Coordinates of C-alpha atoms in Angstrom, one line a residue:
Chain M
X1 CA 0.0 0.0 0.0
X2 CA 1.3 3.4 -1.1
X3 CA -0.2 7.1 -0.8
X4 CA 1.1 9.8 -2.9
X5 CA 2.3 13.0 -0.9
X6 CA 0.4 15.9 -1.0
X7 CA 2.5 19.4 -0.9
X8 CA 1.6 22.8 0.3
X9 CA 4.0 25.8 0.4
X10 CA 3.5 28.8 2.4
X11 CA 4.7 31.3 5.1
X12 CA 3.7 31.5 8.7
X13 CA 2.9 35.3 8.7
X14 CA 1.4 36.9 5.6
X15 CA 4.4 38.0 2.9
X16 CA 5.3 41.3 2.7
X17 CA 8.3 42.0 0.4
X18 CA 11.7 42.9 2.2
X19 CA 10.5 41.8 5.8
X20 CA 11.4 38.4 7.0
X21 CA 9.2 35.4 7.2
X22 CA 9.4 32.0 7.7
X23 CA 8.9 29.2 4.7
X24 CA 7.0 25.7 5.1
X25 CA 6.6 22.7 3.1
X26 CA 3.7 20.5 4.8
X27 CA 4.3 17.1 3.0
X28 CA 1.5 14.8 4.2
X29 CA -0.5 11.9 3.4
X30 CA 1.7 9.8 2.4
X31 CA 2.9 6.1 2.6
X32 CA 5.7 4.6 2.8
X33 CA 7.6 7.1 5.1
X34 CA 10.6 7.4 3.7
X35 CA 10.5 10.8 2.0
X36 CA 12.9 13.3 0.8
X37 CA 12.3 17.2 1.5
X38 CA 14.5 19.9 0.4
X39 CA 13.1 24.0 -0.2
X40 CA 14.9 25.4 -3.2
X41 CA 15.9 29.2 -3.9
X42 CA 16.1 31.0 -7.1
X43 CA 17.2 26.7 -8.2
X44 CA 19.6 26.7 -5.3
X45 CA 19.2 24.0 -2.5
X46 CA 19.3 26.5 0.7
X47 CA 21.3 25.0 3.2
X48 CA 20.3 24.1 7.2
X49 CA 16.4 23.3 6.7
X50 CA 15.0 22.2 9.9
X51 CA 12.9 18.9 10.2
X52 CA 9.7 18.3 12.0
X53 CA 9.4 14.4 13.4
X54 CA 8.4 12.0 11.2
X55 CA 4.4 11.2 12.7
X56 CA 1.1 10.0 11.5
X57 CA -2.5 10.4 11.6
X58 CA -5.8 8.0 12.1
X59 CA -5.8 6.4 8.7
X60 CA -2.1 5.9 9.2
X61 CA -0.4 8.2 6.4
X62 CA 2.6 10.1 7.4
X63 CA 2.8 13.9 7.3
X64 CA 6.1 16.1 8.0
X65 CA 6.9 19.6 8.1
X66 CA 9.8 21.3 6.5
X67 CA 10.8 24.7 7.2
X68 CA 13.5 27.9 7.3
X69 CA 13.8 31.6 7.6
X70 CA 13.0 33.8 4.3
X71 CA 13.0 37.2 3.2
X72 CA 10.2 37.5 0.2
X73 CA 11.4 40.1 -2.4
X74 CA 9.4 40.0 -5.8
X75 CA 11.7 38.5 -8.1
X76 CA 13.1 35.5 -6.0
X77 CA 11.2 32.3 -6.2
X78 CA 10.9 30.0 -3.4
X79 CA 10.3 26.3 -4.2
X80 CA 9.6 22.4 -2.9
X81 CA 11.0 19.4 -4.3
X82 CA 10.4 16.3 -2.8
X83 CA 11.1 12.6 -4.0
X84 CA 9.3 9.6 -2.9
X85 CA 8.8 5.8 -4.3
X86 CA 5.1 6.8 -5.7
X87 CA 7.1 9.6 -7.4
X88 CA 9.2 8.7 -10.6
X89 CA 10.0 12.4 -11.3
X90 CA 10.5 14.4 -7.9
X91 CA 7.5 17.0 -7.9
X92 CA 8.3 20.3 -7.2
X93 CA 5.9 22.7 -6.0
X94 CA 6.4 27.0 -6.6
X95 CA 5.7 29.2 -3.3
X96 CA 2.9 31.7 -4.0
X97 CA 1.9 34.6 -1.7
X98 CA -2.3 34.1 -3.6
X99 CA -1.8 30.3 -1.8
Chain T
X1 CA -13.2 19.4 27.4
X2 CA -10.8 16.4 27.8
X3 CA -7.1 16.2 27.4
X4 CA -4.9 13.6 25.9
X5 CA -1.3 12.1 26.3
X6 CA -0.7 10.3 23.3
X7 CA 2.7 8.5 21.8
X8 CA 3.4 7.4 17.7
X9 CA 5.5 4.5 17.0
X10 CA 7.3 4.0 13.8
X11 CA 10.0 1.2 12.3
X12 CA 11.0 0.9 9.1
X13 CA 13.7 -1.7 7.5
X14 CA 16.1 0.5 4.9
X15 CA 17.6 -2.3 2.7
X16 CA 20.0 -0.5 0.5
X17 CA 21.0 2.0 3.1
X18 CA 21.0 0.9 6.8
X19 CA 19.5 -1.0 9.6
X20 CA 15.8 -0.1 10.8
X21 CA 15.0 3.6 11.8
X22 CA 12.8 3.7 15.1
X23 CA 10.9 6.7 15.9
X24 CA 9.0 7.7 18.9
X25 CA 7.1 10.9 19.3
X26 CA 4.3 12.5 22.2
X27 CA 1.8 14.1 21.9
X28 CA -0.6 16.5 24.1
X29 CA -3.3 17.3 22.7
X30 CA -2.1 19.4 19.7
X31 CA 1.1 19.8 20.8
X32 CA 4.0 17.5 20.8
X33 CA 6.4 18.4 23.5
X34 CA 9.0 15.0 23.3
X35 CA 11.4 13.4 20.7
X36 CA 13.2 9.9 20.4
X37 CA 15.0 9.2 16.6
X38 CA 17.2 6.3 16.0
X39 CA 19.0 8.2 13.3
X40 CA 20.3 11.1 15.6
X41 CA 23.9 11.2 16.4
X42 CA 23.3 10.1 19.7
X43 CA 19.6 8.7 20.2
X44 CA 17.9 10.0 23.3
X45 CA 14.8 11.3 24.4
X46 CA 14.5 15.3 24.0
X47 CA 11.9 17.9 25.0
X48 CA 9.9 19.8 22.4
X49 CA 8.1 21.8 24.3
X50 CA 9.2 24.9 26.7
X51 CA 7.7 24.0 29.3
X52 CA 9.2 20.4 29.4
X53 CA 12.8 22.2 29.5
X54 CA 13.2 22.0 33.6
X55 CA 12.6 18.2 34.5
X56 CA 15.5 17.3 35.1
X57 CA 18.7 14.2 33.9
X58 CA 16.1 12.3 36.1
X59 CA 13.6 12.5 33.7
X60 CA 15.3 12.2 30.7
X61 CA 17.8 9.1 31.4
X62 CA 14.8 7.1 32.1
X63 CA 13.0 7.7 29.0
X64 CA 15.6 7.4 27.0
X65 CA 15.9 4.0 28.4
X66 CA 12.6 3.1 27.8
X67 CA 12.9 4.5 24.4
X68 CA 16.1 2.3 23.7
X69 CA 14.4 -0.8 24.8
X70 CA 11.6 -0.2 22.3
X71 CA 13.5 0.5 19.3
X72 CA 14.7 -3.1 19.8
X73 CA 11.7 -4.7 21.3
X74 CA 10.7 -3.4 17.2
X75 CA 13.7 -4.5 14.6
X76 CA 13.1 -7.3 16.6
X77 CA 9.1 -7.4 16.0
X78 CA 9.8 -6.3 12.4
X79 CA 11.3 -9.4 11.8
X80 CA 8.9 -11.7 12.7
X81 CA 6.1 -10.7 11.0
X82 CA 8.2 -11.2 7.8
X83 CA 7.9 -15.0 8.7
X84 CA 4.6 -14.5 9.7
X85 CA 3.6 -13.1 6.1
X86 CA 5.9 -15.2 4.4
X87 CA 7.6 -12.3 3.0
X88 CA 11.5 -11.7 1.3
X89 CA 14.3 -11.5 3.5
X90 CA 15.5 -8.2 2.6
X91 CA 12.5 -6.1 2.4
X92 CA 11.4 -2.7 3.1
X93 CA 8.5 -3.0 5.6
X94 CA 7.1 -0.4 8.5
X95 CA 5.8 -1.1 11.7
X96 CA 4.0 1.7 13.5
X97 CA 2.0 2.0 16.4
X98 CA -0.3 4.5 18.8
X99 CA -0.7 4.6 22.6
X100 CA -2.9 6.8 24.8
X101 CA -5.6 7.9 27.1
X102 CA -8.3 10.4 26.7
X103 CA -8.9 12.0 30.2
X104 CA -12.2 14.2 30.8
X105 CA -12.4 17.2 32.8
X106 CA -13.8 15.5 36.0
X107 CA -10.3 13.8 36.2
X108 CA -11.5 10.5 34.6
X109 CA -10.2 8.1 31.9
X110 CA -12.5 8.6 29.4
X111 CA -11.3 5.9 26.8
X112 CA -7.8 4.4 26.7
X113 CA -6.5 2.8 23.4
X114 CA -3.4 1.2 21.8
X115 CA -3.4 -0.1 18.1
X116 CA -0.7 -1.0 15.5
X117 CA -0.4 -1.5 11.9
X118 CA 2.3 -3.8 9.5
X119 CA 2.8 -1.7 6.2
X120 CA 0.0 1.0 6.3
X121 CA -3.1 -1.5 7.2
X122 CA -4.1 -2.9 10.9
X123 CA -2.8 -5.4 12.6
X124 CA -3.8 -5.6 16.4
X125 CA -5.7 -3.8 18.2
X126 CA -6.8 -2.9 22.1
X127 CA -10.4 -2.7 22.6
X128 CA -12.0 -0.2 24.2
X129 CA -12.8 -2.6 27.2
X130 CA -9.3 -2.7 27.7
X131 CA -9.7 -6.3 28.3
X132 CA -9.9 -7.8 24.5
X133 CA -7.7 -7.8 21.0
X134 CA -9.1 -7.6 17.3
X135 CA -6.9 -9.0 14.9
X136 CA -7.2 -7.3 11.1
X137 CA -5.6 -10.7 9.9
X138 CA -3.9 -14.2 10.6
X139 CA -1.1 -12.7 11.4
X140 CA -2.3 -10.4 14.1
X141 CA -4.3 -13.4 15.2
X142 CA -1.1 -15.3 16.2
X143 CA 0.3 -12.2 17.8
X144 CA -3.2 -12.2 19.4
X145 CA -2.7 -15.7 20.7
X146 CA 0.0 -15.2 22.1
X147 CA -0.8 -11.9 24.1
X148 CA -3.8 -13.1 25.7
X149 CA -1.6 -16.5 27.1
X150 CA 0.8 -13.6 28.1
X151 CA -2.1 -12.1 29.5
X152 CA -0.6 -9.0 28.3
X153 CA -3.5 -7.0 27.9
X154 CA -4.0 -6.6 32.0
X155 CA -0.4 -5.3 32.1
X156 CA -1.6 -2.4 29.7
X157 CA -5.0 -1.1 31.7
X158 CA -2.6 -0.8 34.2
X159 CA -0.5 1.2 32.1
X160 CA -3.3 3.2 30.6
X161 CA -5.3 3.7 33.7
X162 CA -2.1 4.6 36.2
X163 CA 1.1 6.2 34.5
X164 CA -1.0 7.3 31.1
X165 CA -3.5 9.6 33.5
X166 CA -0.9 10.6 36.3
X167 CA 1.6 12.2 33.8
X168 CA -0.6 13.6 31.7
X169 CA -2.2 15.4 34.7
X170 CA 1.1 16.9 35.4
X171 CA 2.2 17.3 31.9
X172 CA -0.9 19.8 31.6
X173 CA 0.7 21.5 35.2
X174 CA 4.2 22.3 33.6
X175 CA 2.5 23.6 30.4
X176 CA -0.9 25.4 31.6
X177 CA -0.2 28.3 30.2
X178 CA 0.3 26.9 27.0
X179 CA -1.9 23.7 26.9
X180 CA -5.1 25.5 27.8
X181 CA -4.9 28.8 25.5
X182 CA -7.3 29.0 23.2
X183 CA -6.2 31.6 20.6
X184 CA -8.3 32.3 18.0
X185 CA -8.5 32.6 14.1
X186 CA -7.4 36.1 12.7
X187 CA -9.6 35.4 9.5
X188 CA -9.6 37.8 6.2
X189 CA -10.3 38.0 2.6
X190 CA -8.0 38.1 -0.7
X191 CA -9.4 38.8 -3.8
X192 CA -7.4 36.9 -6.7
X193 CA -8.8 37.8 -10.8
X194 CA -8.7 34.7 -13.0
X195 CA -8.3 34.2 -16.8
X196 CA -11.7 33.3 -17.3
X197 CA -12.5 36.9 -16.4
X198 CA -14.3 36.3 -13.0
X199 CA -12.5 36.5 -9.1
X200 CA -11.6 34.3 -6.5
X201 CA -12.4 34.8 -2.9
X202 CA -9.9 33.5 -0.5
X203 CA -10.7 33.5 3.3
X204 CA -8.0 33.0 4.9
X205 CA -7.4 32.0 9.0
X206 CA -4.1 32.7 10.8
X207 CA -3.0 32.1 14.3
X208 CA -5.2 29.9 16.0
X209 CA -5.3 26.9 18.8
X210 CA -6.2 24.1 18.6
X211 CA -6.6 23.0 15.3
X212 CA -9.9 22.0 15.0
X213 CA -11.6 24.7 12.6
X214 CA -14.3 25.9 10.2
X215 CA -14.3 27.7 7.5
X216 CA -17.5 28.3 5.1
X217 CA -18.7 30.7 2.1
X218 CA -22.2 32.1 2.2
X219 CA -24.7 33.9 -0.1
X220 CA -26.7 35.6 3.1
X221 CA -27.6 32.6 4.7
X222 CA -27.2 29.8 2.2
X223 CA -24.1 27.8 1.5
X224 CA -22.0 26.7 -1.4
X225 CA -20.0 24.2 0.0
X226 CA -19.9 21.6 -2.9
X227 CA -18.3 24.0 -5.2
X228 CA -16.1 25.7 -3.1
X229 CA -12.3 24.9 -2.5
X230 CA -11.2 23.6 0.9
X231 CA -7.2 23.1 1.9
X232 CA -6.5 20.7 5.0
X233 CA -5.4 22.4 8.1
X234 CA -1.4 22.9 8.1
X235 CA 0.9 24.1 10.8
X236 CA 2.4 27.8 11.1
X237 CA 5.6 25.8 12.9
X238 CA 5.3 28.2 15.6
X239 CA 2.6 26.0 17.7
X240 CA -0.3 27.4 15.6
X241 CA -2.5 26.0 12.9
X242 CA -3.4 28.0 9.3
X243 CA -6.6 27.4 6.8
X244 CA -8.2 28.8 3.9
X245 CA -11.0 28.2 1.8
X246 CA -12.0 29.7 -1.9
X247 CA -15.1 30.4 -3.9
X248 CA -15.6 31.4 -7.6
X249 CA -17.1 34.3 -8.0
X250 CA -18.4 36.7 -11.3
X251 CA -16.8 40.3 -11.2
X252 CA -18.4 42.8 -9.0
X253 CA -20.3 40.8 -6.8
X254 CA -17.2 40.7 -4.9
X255 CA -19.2 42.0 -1.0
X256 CA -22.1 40.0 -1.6
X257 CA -20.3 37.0 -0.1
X258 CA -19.6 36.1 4.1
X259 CA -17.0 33.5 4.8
X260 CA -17.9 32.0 8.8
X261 CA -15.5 31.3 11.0
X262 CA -15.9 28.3 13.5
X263 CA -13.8 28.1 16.7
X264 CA -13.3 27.3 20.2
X265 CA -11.3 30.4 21.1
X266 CA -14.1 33.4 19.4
X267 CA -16.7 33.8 21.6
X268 CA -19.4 33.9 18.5
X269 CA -18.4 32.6 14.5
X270 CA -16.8 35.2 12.4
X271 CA -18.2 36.7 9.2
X272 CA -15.6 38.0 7.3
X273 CA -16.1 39.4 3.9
X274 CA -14.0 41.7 1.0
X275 CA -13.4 45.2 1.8
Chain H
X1 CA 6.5 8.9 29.8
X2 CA 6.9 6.1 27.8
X3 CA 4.5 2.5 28.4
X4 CA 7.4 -0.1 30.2
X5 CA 7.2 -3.5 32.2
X6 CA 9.1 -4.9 30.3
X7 CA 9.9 -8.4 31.6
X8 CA 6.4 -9.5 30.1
X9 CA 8.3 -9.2 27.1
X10 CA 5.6 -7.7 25.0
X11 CA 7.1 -9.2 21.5
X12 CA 4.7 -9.7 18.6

């Protein structure tokens, strides 16, 4: 049995542009738990992401949170890319300040 | 309005990389305030949680120990039910299990519970009666078998009646002013055009504990919640929960719409709206 | 704090 991570990005205080924030990748839902989380900048791998502990809900599926400290400005783009077995290309998901 | 204390299990058997990863984490309520990983550089139990910060080496050495014991009680467990499946030798299987007791505001257990599961689906369960299994399949049937010989299921009442209500009772004492806030949702509205020329409303809500939440659209009065948009509750990593939910809507009729707001922590629902 | 016994043995 094998459930397909869902993937939402977003900050924990509403964005506003040059004022520092914090970024999150809630990867959840999934199955089995061996996942791989990294949050990408401007295509760059930033470095020193912390890690939530690996937990689980009712029905089971796993669900981890990955986060770090970011600074929105307009023209930088903030991503998630994570690679799992239901995965055969590793699905990347933008940030967007509307989400 | 109860409280919990409640504890996640996991194993898992890495052929290709290592040996098993165990992984033990608490829970109370919404809030986990304790950590044991397998893969840290030095396994041992560690606080999440401010208020669990003063207890002491004590504390600490004797839940790690307990902790230790467990992660081999389980690459020990995940072996087994290999043979008792019939499965490959070097396979990647997981193991996880939840412990825990709901206690009531009087001071009573209101239900105490413990159930497992071998790669995503049950296995063995504590019933409610605290007293009984239920076995998902054969398998868990012989593990079954074997636990009520044991008589193992008197050992865990005792568990889940004494230590599991005790602790928690003073878990909630060295956290009060954290485990019984109730902050609640700072809700609002964002107004997104799409390319089919209409708008999207998005109601957001920020800030709030616990995590239990509502969120619905309205036409003054009447609901449109089977063509609305919902997004599953995520946490702000700060100890409070975020949600949002969006309608479709033609341009211009942009204030006709309400979004309500349902929590514990507002004293009456929210109505927020685009301004 | 963690469920312990542990001389039960409480193997699957």
């Amino acid at each position: 049995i094998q459930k397909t991570p869902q993937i939402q990005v977003y900050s924990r205080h509403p964005p506003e542009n040059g004022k520092p924030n914090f970024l999150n990748c809630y990867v959840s839902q999934f199955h089995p738990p061996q996942i791989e989380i990294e949050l990408l900048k401007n295509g760059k791998k930033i470095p020193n992401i912390e890690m939530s502990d690996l937990s689980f809900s009712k029905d089971w599926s796993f669900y981890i949170l990955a986060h770090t400290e970011f600074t929105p400005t307009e023209t930088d783009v903030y991503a998630c890319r994570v690679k799992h077995v239901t995965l055969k290309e590793p699905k990347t998901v933008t940030w967007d300040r509307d989400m | 309005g109860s409280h919990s204390l409640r504890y996640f299990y996991t194993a898992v058997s890495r052929p290709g990389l290592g040996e098993p990863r165990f992984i033990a984490v608490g829970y109370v309520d919404d809030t986990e305030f304790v950590r044991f990983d397998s893969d840290a550089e030095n396994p041992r139990m560690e606080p999440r949680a401010r208020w669990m910060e003063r207890e002491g080496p004590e504390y600490w050495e004797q839940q790690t120990r307990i902790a230790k014991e467990w992660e081999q009680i389980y690459r020990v467990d995940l072996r087994t039910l290999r043979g008792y499946y019939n499965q490959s030798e070097g396979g990647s299987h997981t193991i996880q299990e939840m412990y825990g007791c709901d206690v009531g505001s009087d001071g009573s257990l209101l239900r105490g519970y413990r159930q497992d599961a071998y790669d995503g689906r049950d296995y063995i369960a504590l019933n409610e009666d605290l007293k009984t299994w239920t076995a998902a399949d054969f398998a868990a049937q012989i593990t079954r078998n074997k636990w009520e010989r044991a008589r193992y299921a008197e050992r865990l009442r005792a568990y889940l009646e004494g230590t599991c209500v005790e602790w928690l009772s003073r878990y909630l004492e060295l956290g009060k002013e954290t485990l019984l806030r109730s902050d609640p949702p700072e809700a609002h509205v964002t107004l997104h055009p799409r390319p089919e020329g209409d708008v999207t409303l998005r109601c957001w809500a920020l800030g709030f504990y616990p995590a239990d939440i509502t969120l619905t659209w309205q036409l003054n009065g009447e609901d449109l919640t089977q063509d609305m948009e919902l997004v599953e509750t995520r946490p702000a990593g700060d100890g409070t929960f975020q949600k949002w939910a969006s309608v479709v809507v033609p341009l211009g009729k942009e204030q006709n719409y309400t979004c309500r707001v349902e929590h514990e922590g507002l004293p009456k629902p929210l109505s927020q709206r685009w301004e | 704090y963690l469920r312990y016994d542990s001389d039960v043995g409480e193997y699957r």
